[PDB]
Design an enzyme around this catalytic site. Sequence first.
Site, PDB file in Angstrom:
ATOM      1  CD  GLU A 213      -2.742  -1.201  -0.050  1.00 39.69           C
ATOM      2  OE1 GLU A 213      -3.009  -0.009  -0.848  1.00 39.69           O
ATOM      3  OE2 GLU A 213      -2.948  -2.203  -0.649  1.00 39.69           O
ATOM      4  CD  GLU A 240      -3.537  -3.192  -7.164  1.00 35.14           C
ATOM      5  OE1 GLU A 240      -2.560  -3.671  -6.596  1.00 35.14           O
ATOM      6  OE2 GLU A 240      -4.435  -2.552  -6.832  1.00 35.14           O
TER       7      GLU A 240
HETATM    8  C1  LIG Z   1      -3.420  -6.148  -0.543  1.00 35.42           C
HETATM    9  O1  LIG Z   1      -4.699  -6.207  -1.155  1.00 35.42           O
HETATM   10  C2  LIG Z   1      -4.935  -6.839  -2.389  1.00 35.42           C
HETATM   11  C3  LIG Z   1      -5.997  -6.447  -3.241  1.00 35.42           C
HETATM   12  C4  LIG Z   1      -6.343  -4.892  -3.065  1.00 35.42           C
HETATM   13  C5  LIG Z   1      -7.134  -4.677  -4.385  1.00 35.42           C
HETATM   14  C6  LIG Z   1      -8.652  -4.883  -4.348  1.00 35.42           C
HETATM   15  N1  LIG Z   1      -9.247  -4.424  -5.584  1.00 35.42           N
HETATM   16  C7  LIG Z   1      -9.834  -2.773  -5.123  1.00 35.42           C
HETATM   17  C8  LIG Z   1      -8.448  -4.195  -6.549  1.00 35.42           C
HETATM   18  C9  LIG Z   1      -8.012  -5.617  -7.352  1.00 35.42           C
HETATM   19  C10 LIG Z   1      -8.837  -6.855  -6.960  1.00 35.42           C
HETATM   20  C11 LIG Z   1      -8.098  -8.283  -7.138  1.00 35.42           C
HETATM   21  C12 LIG Z   1      -7.342  -8.866  -6.434  1.00 35.42           C
HETATM   22  C13 LIG Z   1      -6.625 -10.054  -6.904  1.00 35.42           C
HETATM   23  C14 LIG Z   1      -7.000 -10.780  -7.812  1.00 35.42           C
HETATM   24  F1  LIG Z   1      -6.567 -12.003  -8.020  1.00 35.42           F
HETATM   25  C15 LIG Z   1      -8.154 -10.273  -8.742  1.00 35.42           C
HETATM   26  C16 LIG Z   1      -8.522 -10.939  -9.931  1.00 35.42           C
HETATM   27  C17 LIG Z   1      -8.816  -8.871  -8.505  1.00 35.42           C
HETATM   28  C18 LIG Z   1      -5.098  -4.106  -3.246  1.00 35.42           C
HETATM   29  O2  LIG Z   1      -4.643  -4.637  -4.346  1.00 35.42           O
HETATM   30  N2  LIG Z   1      -4.935  -3.048  -2.798  1.00 35.42           N
HETATM   31  O3  LIG Z   1      -3.839  -1.986  -3.044  1.00 35.42           O
HETATM   32  C19 LIG Z   1      -4.865  -8.527  -2.412  1.00 35.42           C
HETATM   33  C20 LIG Z   1      -4.163  -9.297  -3.393  1.00 35.42           C
HETATM   34  C21 LIG Z   1      -4.150 -10.406  -3.493  1.00 35.42           C
HETATM   35  C22 LIG Z   1      -4.965 -11.232  -2.149  1.00 35.42           C
HETATM   36  F2  LIG Z   1      -4.709 -12.625  -1.922  1.00 35.42           F
HETATM   37  C23 LIG Z   1      -5.113 -10.547  -1.100  1.00 35.42           C
HETATM   38  C24 LIG Z   1      -5.220  -9.038  -1.322  1.00 35.42           C
HETATM   39 ZN   LIG Z   2      -2.609  -2.769  -4.753  1.00 39.23          ZN
END
Ligand SMILES: CO[C@H](C[C@H](CCN(C)CCCc1ccc(F)c(C)c1)C(=O)NO)c1ccc(F)cc1
Ligand SMILES: [Zn+2]
Length: 399
Positions: A213, A240
């Site tokens: 973050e 991302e």
């Molecule tokens: C640290 O938090 C992240 C997701 C969150 C974005 C949330 N949304 C707004 C953005 C994209 C969502 C997403 C996250 C992972 C994924 F595989 C797909 C297909 C979609 C984010 O990326 N904040 O910066 C995370 C990634 C993998 C995990 F297993 C758990 C959490």
């Molecule tokens: Zn992120």
Amino acid sequence: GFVNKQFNYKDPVNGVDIAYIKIPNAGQMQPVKAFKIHNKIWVIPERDTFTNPEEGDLNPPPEAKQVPVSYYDSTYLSTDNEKDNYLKGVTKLFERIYSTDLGRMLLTSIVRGIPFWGGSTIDTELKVIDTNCINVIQPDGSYRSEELNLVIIGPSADIIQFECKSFGHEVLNLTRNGYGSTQYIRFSPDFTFGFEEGAGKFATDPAVTLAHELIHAGHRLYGIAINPNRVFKLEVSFEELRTFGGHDAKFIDSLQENEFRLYYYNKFKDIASTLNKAKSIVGTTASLQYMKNVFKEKYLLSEDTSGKFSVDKLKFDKLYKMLTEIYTEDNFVKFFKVLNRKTYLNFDKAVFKINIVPKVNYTIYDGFNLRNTNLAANFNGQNTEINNMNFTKLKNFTG
Ligand SMILES: CO[C@H](C[C@H](CCN(C)CCCc1ccc(F)c(C)c1)C(=O)NO)c1ccc(F)cc1
Ligand SMILES: [Zn+2]
């Protein structure tokens, strides 16, 4: 020490680094207790029902999110003791990041990343943008405006939805025009999510997640975030992929990187010309000379003997690469020497309650992987089946 006072949530307000504040959400809100952990960085141990007043309800949605893992608990972070534990957790995560050279560098870049003074309707006048400030209450109940770069706040409804967000502007795209804006990171140190490596079942080190973050915040403070509508084809945003780094980041090809590179050189040049043509400033405490020097340091501008600014391409490239290729989640994983999932995408849903505040659980130096014990081997400390006392598995939300 990145955070020099070890705040307790009970500690009495002093209107300097412990205060009741309001954020410029454009709504009426009541003041919340907040803590200044370092110049330009505050922490608010509350569930975030504020950055978007249209997100007050901490209950689960009828349609469950499918990826990644999600979790709801409307009562979490409602008591003084969780707020106190929340505050010590976030502080500890900052010290863990700062104890690395990459972390030290990242955090220093964030502190210099003052949002640009582009608030004036007059093209020759510098002026702060109010949404880059908070209002701090004083004894007589009046409010003073204070500039800041970063706020760490507790999650909204989905406890494990972490994100870096900020207040927008009517015409300006502050996170993409080189200006930057104050960033609000929804984050909890009290929970983490698992990944697989049947297969071994591991927990993400939350210092890695926070760093993730902070990397977003870095981009957005320097106004170089990639528009979220730019995606790599499933569907994942370039922003991302960039932030995660590692093999993922090489999917943003060589050509789009060059466009962004050129695009932002041009932004930085514009900011330099706005500064060169500046003849006046709004505000009581900072001189035009003082703010000009603040932005010189931020954008690593070159100053000639007559006081005029320009961008040095060498120093621009280095700054840009620093913020986008050096500061990555993958790079922190190396420096922390912990285990982390191999790609941004993560379909193996699992969420855990953790508590990193006690040193018997988690240290600034080793995280869960305590040196000289059984948990230093094979990332045992992050193995949710070996170090099971440190990871209480929760029912992930399915609807
Ligand atoms: C640290 O938090 C992240 C997701 C969150 C974005 C949330 N949304 C707004 C953005 C994209 C969502 C997403 C996250 C992972 C994924 F595989 C797909 C297909 C979609 C984010 O990326 N904040 O910066 C995370 C990634 C993998 C995990 F297993 C758990 C959490
Ligand atoms: Zn992120």
